[PDB]
Amino acid sequence: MASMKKKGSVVIVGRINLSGDTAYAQQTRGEEGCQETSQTGRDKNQVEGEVQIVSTATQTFLATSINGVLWTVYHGAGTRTIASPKGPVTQMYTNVDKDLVGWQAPQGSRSLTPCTCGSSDLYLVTRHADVIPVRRRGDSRGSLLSPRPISYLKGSSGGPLLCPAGHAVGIFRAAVSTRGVAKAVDFIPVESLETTMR
Numbered sequence: 001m002a003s004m005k006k007k008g009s010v011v012i013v014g015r016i017n018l019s020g021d022t023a024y025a026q027q028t029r030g031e032e033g034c035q036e037t038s039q040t041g042r043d044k045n046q047v048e049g050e051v052q053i054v055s056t057a058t059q060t061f062l063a064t065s066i067n068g069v070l071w072t073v074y075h076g077a078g079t080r081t082i083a084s085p086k087g088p089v090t091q092m093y094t095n096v097d098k099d100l101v102g103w104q105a106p107q108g109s110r111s112l113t114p115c116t117c118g119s120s121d122l123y124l125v126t127r128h129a130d131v132i133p134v135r136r137r138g139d140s141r142g143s144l145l146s147p148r149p150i151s152y153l154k155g156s157s158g159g160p161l162l163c164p165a166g167h168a169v170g171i172f173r174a175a176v177s178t179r180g181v182a183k184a185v186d187f188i189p190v191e192s193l194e195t196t197m198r
């Protein structure tokens with residue numbers, strides 16, 4: 001009992017910059033400071049933007065602010081706290097059945113607006129700041145206009161699917177692949193986030 005360890009916090013280690021004409025990834029914390037911040041849960045770095053790059057000791061993925069909540073996937077974050085300036089912050093939403101978790105959005109983040117356009121021409125933002133056109137094919141599925149090996153999507157769970165107007169349509173959850181090629185994506189619809197919020 002006395003030797004039982006505690007899992008560290010999720011740590012924001014960068015962001016996908018979508019503020020201008022060019023999307024690009026930025027790193028805000030190196031691996032060493034990440035490990036220390038994960039243990040203490042104390043992250044004094046200023047947060048900016050809608051899409052964060054997050055890490056644990058063993059995984060890296062994305063997290064997306066929508067409606068004042070920073071959302072990501074349960075298969076990345078588990079039940080972990082997230083680091084913040086004043087210490088670990090406990091999840092506000094947890095739903096393993098949807099592969100979904102959420103924390104209060106960090107001070108300084110900006111939130112995406114939930115999409116009400118009803119459009120099926122979507123855009124997936126990856127951890128490498130690729131903007132991938134995706135045609136919506138169902139409530140939780142969309143096809144890549146240009147399929148790519150799954151290597152190019154690995155690490156992007158928790159990222160957004162956006163409509164042409166830049167609203168949040170869903171959270172990237174899983175890749176649909178045949179012989180290692182991602183032809184489609186599975187995502188958590190924003191309406192499912194809004195229901196979780198109730």
Ligand SMILES: COc1ccc2nc(C)c(O[C@@H]3C[C@H]4C(=O)N[C@]5(C(=O)NS(=O)(=O)C6(C)CC6)C[C@H]5/C=C\CCCCC[C@H](NC(=O)OC(C)(C)C)C(=O)N4C3)nc2c1
Pocket residue numbers: 059060061062074075076096097098099150151153154155156157172173174175176177186
């Ligand atoms: C632990 O409790 C739970 C609860 C609910 C749950 N629901 C789930 C649906 C679920 O799927 C598992 C995790 C998820 C996943 O890899 N996503 C990411 C990702 O980037 N991840 S990540 O950032 O690298 C990471 C690993 C966090 C750091 C987006 C894709 C990028 C490349 C695909 C790699 C090849 C795996 C292809 C799987 N295709 C797949 O299952 O397709 C369907 C059509 C769904 C069968 C897949 O995509 N997979 C399996 N796991 C869970 C686990």
Ligand SMILES: [Zn+2]
Pocket residue numbers: 114115116117118119163164165166167168
């Ligand atoms: Zn929209």
